[model samples]
Target: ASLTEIEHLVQSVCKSYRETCQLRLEDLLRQRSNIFSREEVTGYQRKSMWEMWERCAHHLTEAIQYVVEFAKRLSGFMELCQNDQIVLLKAGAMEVVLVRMCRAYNADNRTVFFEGKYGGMELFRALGCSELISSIFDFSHSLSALHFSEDEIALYTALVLINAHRPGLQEKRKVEQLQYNLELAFHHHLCKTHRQSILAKLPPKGKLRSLCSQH
Candidate 1:
């Protein structure tokens, strides 16, 4: 398929999956509501919304990986079109959106906070692949110049190893080691470096105090 065609197909599939997941989440919530009276369910207990959102986001991430792998396997036939670069960039952008959304969702769910952290790792993998493609095309200067902290970089590298899906006892140990490294990196600054514009808008200390008071 042409690059444009493939892009459209991937986008359409993602949209459909998102809509389906949203519907499923709504259904789940409705069922939960029917099973428990509103008074019986505390605000905290209604965190199924966040859980469903995380599941949906994770599914989308996996789907993107699958699509990219398929494209890579078929690259010989599609080489003339140079669609690989486009695919890599798009995938990286998708990872950014997924990671940001997962972070927002995780702000409220302690049990699933690692999902957001892993999402950051996923973003790094996508960014690394995107950078590789840019370098291949001698377009490194054209690459998106996002700044990532050391911790974020470490998280991404760790996540990449975990996502390899290697099977065996030794592989599991490696995963554990990576997890430990990520935790060690976690206490340090974890800011995204590339988008200073967005970071600048973060509430000042006074504003943050005011915001917290409202809560």
Candidate 2:
């Protein structure tokens, strides 16, 4: 596919998936207004640790659904060897979930919109994976800081999914080619828009790997 074709395919799939699956910040804001009094909204009400963990797990499961679907829809992804497809998803789905979460993040107030509410760290403290929670919140906070446009976010998410270096690839050449196409597309996007500096601010290569380990 041409660069434009690839970009559109990637962005349109992402845009549609996000619209259908994501919790919008505005929607969350409206729900919060009607659903909680000021005191309750700011209060630290704990679910049992198990309950909280289950809730968080449910959210990740839902995200993986979108990730899997999204991966399948990417151009050329299905043409890869079946083993490569499974390997990529197993290794990279959580990273894509983390990337997707930023769409629901409220950078202004440092809260996330999830499970029908907008909440800060204290609200998720009951989830009991404090280290994991902090890393996620931190990742979103820093990612949101870059103020990436939707197109940029979509391209980057594609890059994360098409990674070439995961172990046990039966067809490394095909994987690397797909990754390279995405990298070129992403680089062209940054250069075309005069946002090249954002490249410097991208999370370190190992950052997502370390973040995923907490799950």
Candidate 3:
């Protein structure tokens, strides 16, 4: 497979595993509390809790092992795709999850329960699969190295300018830029080449628009 293809596959698999871990963590949390509250317990509850704790311990060990395996797979994919800028970009995006997992594993002083919950939240933040897709946009005016097509460069420039708090009618400019980018991605041949079909599986534009609006 091409580097882009491998990058896409690894990203998909990592995202799948991360989401599964999050859901399991969320389920465990819900079973422990309804109002999303965290607390300490003991006594007879401790005995039953210890049993549950052992079970959770086993489950979490399995989860952590899966995370490690996924990370290794992702690293292998990254190695395979190192020569492609687009593949590197996708790998960076997927690294957000592994980074989160690493943080979670280190959150506590070797305490499983404390580390698990806090780490899960960290993973959610880092790799929650938000709509933003590209962290590359977070930087300013450094696109030449990205090797984007002319239309892509134009679209990105427009987006940056519109997002700029410049004193003019920036909203109008942003709309225009977004439209241009959308068109470039959907219409232009060379520009569209970098577009990932996996993007089509993402949340609707309305959802992404809502997220952008929040910023």
Candidate 4:
């Protein structure tokens, strides 16, 4: 396809990524059911620390399932050899999880909303990630800076998985080429958006503000 057509593909595919992610997020409560019945969660009460741990385990399990499902729905991942698919899915799962988690992140509050509860960062710190958790705050902050659109999340997911150097890949070149095309599309998409954003900017001669005030 031509560059103009490739630009359109990028735009449209990115749009698909966004639309699908939203629908999935909207169905999260439904997906949670595969892990725990609503009655089981709501009618019962937490009594022991083990139960809390169990809940976290359950959350972890269910979360991965979504990641797997996410990779499956990513359009072209399934066509790769099972080994290549395995490598990318496992490799890509890390970022995908965090990307999805930030959907309910409260940057102002530093909390992660899960199971109807807002968890503070200290909980993560307590779990041996105080150092790791610190980095997440920064990562999350950068993510917030992007105001991550759903498609961007998808693009980022695809981008992260297309590693040419991933170990044991039977088709490294195929992986690399796919990655190359994705990068080209991503770059084109960025260029188009960048132009639009530049056009959208305030005129350089516009009135200025921020004068110091003593009144």
Candidate 5:
């Protein structure tokens, strides 16, 4: 199909897939406005630590499910060599999920919508993986600074998946064509809003891969 159609598909899929399970930051903040006064412990027990991990894992699993849906629904995605499809999904899914978190982030307060509450690094302290949590927040903060629309986020995520550089791609040319159209579509949308500088604002791909490896 045409790039415009693909663009709309990405936007719709991102919006719908996320709304079904993705928690909104404002809603959580408003709901728990009075509950933030409690003083939780600085150090967590091993039992509680795993609980936090499990909570995060559950959220991430849901995010990944959305990514898979986004991928499968893309036009001509299933037309790629079957092995290449798996490679792209396996490599790019987490990165897209991390990018999606920007939608739930509140840069002003430096907190994310976690579980049923809005929280910062302290909220994830119980998880005990300081580096991963810190990196995630840092990355989220960086992405939030870019102020991308839902459509741009969708197009960027599409580019991430159709990347021709991923290993084990037998039909590299096919993947490249898809990625090129996505890039054009992304730039067209950005140009329409006169936010031409966003091309320079994207965080390095290495940083995202590094962020995912922490898991």
Candidate 6:
């Protein structure tokens, strides 16, 4: 299989190294999950519109923590001054977090959880969710349709975090390069995945090779 090597990196039945990765994953997911923990829906109907706002606030809080930790792991993050580092995180952290959160989106069910009894998108209608929010649901559906791999999600997050155009950047060029490198990795992954996807469609090997090259 094309991904036998990749599959090897996936977690197994509680072995040592795989176990450590699982533990770390558990911690991260818990952090992500705890941000807007939902309890039994107990608020008055009149207050429900306002009560859900805490979810957005919680997402922002999680975004702040996520960007700092995400930045610390990337060498490019330290390329800027401390002030600029904070500026960059301030500027783009929400976007990065939003992308990461999409993994939890259940587009088919029209559900986005908010530590809740009911799915989040399900409640937005009552909250006067604008068409803009509906557009996000559409986007989530299309994005989920792609079913990006974990490696792809990492690169996508890296790309979002490395965005350099968010004002107050002393090292715009350096940050762009950081984004560009992740872009290259994405390009490579897409080309290969397309190659494999097309190959399965039984196009001639020669044509599949030609199509992959175009990407």
lDDT of each: 0.33, 0.77, 0.33, 0.57, 0.74, 0.52
Arrange candidates by lDDT, descending. 2, 5, 4, 6, 3, 1
By TM-score, the candidates rank as: 2, 5, 4, 6, 3, 1
lDDT of 6 at 101: 54
Task: Give each prediction's root-mean-square deviation over alpha carbons.
Answer: 18.4, 2.9, 16.5, 11.4, 3.1, 10.5
Candidate 4 residues lying further than 4 Å off, grouped into runs, are 4-16, 19-53, 124-128, 195-215
TM-score of each: 0.21, 0.85, 0.24, 0.67, 0.83, 0.63
Clashes of 6: 1
Residues 1-215 of candidate 6 have per-residue lDDT tens digits of 13442333221111212221212434443444332324333232235656556766676586567556666656556666777778767666665555555566665555554543225454554456546566566655665676655555555556566676667777788777766655555555657566335223222323312322322
The TM-score that candidate 4 achieves is 0.67
Best by TM-score: 2
Select the stronger candidate by lDDT from 4 and 6.
4
lDDT of 2 by residue, 1-215 (tens): 78777567556645645653455545655654333335764444545777767877898888888788878777778999999999999999889888878877777777777666667777766666677777788999999899867677777887888888999899999999989877877787778789999998999997888876656
Against the correct fold, how does model 6 do in TM-score? 0.63
The lDDT, on a scale of 0 to 1, for candidate 4 is: 0.57
Error of 5 at 22 (Å): 4.0
Instruction: lDDT for model 2, please.
Output: 0.77
Colliding residue pairs in candidate 5: none
Candidate 3 lDDT, 1-215, residue by residue in tens: 33454344434443544543443434433433222123332221234535645654666566555444443443223332223323223223222322222222322222113322432221222333334423222221122224333333322222222222223332444334433443333333333365454234323333323433433
Give me the displacement of residue 84 in model 4, in angstroms: 0.5
Candidate 6 clashing pairs, residues 3+ apart or interchain: 38-115
